[PDB]
């Protein structure tokens, strides 16, 4: 007795492709790797309840390859399976609204993702891949499962792996439209003279070495080939935010002098991030947890500042 059902395959969950599946055969035999809202059904035979449902499949023909690239801006063959494997976990996480922002309840070492997500909602940033546009829209609304699985997929992190907030933001920024952002720096060494530099896109909004925007504007000290220490300062900046980063160090955060920041406690193998946002007062969001204070000291790794246009007074 031959029994079949109609299902739809997809790579982007928007464009659907009609299929008829033989119920005596697994999905894998008919589609290759197959997933149902993140669950791997490759080795599963079709069920009655599957009629009319949508299954993700790996791009196995030209139409799916193009739809997948256009949606995700990647051709990495393992991407889709990594997105699905993550989604199967992020689906089960909780996304409380904490002080008006979508957070994530702690699970599976995801503190780095909560503080990244809380940060995004505080800076002006538009994603390029439609997958991130759509999923970020839902995350802002409270349904962040797909966005978090996508972050994992894009950063090649699996659920449970310890992450780095700076590295994660780097990947997110890579997939954002920062074409307008420009940075000008000058470096003065008393043996080599001076050198000016211009940076664009991601490199225009990220700096590694100091947490303080003001200190960047006045000068910091870096090594030279000559052997002397030079001074680097910020000549001009064009961007809606800047991110300053440093190895974690005790650092004092003053209300109203920054947008938000990330705090890291522990060591390189394992530790814990928390998020500090400056609103009417200082709020610390630790996943689902919230505390407040008027002043804050702690081991800060990243600080985010607002910006529009800045020209250095320094002659
Ligand atoms: C074969 O696996 C994948 C292929 C593509 C895109 N291919 N597009 C081209 N090669 S022109 C995208 C993926 O995830 C979004 C995959 O997992
Ligand atoms: Cl967006
Ligand atoms: Zn020199």
* Ion ligand 2 neighbours, Cβ < 5 Å: 126-127, 133, 136
Q: Give, in order, the Cα–Cα distances in Å from 63 to each of 15, 58, 100, 134.
A: 10, 11, 41, 21
**Buried b vs exposed e over 34-69: b needs ≥16 C-beta within 10 Å?**
bbbebebbbeeebeeebeeebbbbbbeeeebeebbe
Residue 108 CB neighbours (<10 A): 17
Alpha-carbon Rg for the chain, nearest whole angstrom, is 23
Question: Which strands, in side-by-side order, build the sheet including 34-36?
Answer: 17-22, 4-10, 54-57, 34-36, 39-40
Q: Ligand 3 centroid to 212 CA: how many Å?
A: 25
Q: Are strands 241-253 and 271-278 parallel, antiparallel or unpaired?
A: unpaired
Determination technique for this entry: X-ray
Q: CB–CB of 85/153 below 8 Å?
A: no
How far apart, in whole angstroms, are the C-alpha atoms of residue 17 and residue 8? Answer: 5
CA pair distance 118, 253, nearest whole angstrom: 17
Resolution, angstroms, 1 dp: 1.9
For the CA atoms of 79, 81, 85, 87, the dihedral, rounded to the nearest 10 degrees, stands at 60
Name the strand (E) or helix (H) holding 205: helix 202-205
- At 39, is the secondary structure helix, strand, or coil? strand
Residue count of the chain: 315
Q: Which of 10, 67, 68 has most ligand 1 atoms within 8 Å of CB, for mutation?
A: 68
User: What CA–CA distance (Å, rounded) separates 263 from 156?
Assistant: 23
Torsion of CA 75, 76, 78, 82, to 10 degrees: -90
| Nearest residue to 256 (alpha-carbon basis) of 276, 239, 279 | 279
Q: Using CA positions, which residue lies closest to atom 8 of ligand 1?
A: 65
Both tokens of 27, joined, read 């999905």
Q: How far apart are CA 102 and CA 51, in angstroms?
A: 34
Strands 229-238 and 220-223 turn out to be: antiparallel
* Alpha carbons within 13 A on the beta-carbon side of 175: 22
Tokens 């947890």 identify what position?
289
User: How many angstroms separate the Cα of 218 from the Cα of each of 213, 242, 312?
Assistant: 9, 16, 9
Question: Residue 155 has which token pair?
Answer: 């950063």
Q: What is the DSSP letter of 53?
A: -
Nearest to 35 by CA among 75, 68, 73, 82: 82
Q: Which residues line ligand 1 (CB under 6 A)?
A: 58-59, 65, 68-69, 72, 74-75, 77, 79-80
Distance in angstroms (rounded) separating the CA atoms of residues 95 and 144: 7
């Amino acid at each position: 007795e031959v029994r079949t059902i109609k299902v739809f395959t997809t790579v982007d969950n928007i464009n659907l492709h009609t299929q008829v599946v033989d119920m005596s055969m697994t999905y894998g035999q008919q589609f290759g790797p197959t997933y149902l809202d993140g669950a791997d059904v490759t080795k599963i035979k079709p069920h009655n309840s599957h009629e009319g449902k949508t299954f993700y499949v790996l791009p196995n023909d030209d139409t799916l390859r193009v739809e997948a690239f256009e949606y995700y801006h990647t051709t990495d063959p393992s991407f889709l399976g990594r997105y699905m494997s993550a989604l199967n976990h992020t689906k089960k996480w909780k996304y409380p609204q904490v002080n008006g922002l979508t957070s994530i309840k702690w699970a599976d070492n995801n503190c780095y993702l909560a503080t990244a997500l809380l940060t995004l909602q505080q800076i002006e940033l538009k994603f390029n891949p439609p997958a991130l546009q759509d999923a970020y829209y839902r995350a802002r609304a409270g349904e962040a499962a797909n966005f978090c699985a996508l972050i994992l997929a894009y950063c090649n992190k699996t659920v449970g792996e310890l992450g780095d907030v700076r590295e994660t933001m780097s990947y997110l920024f890579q997939h954002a439209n920062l074409d307008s952002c420009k940075r000008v720096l000058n470096v003065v060494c008393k043996t080599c003279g001076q050198q000016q530099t211009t940076l664009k896109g991601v490199e225009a909004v990220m700096y590694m070495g100091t947490l303080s925007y003001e200190q960047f504007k006045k000068g910091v000290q870096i090594p030279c080939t000559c052997g002397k220490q030079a001074t680097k300062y910020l000549v001009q900046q064009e961007s809606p935010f800047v991110m300053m980063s440093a190895p974690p160090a005790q650092y004092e955060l003053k209300h109203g002098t920054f947008t938000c920041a990330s705090e890291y406690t522990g060591n390189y193998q394992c530790g814990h991030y928390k998020h500090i946002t400056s609103k009417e007062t200082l709020y610390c969001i630790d996943g689902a947890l919230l505390t407040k204070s008027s002043e804050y000291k702690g081991p800060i790794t990243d600080v985010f500042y607002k910006e529009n246009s800045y020209t250095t007074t320094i002659k």
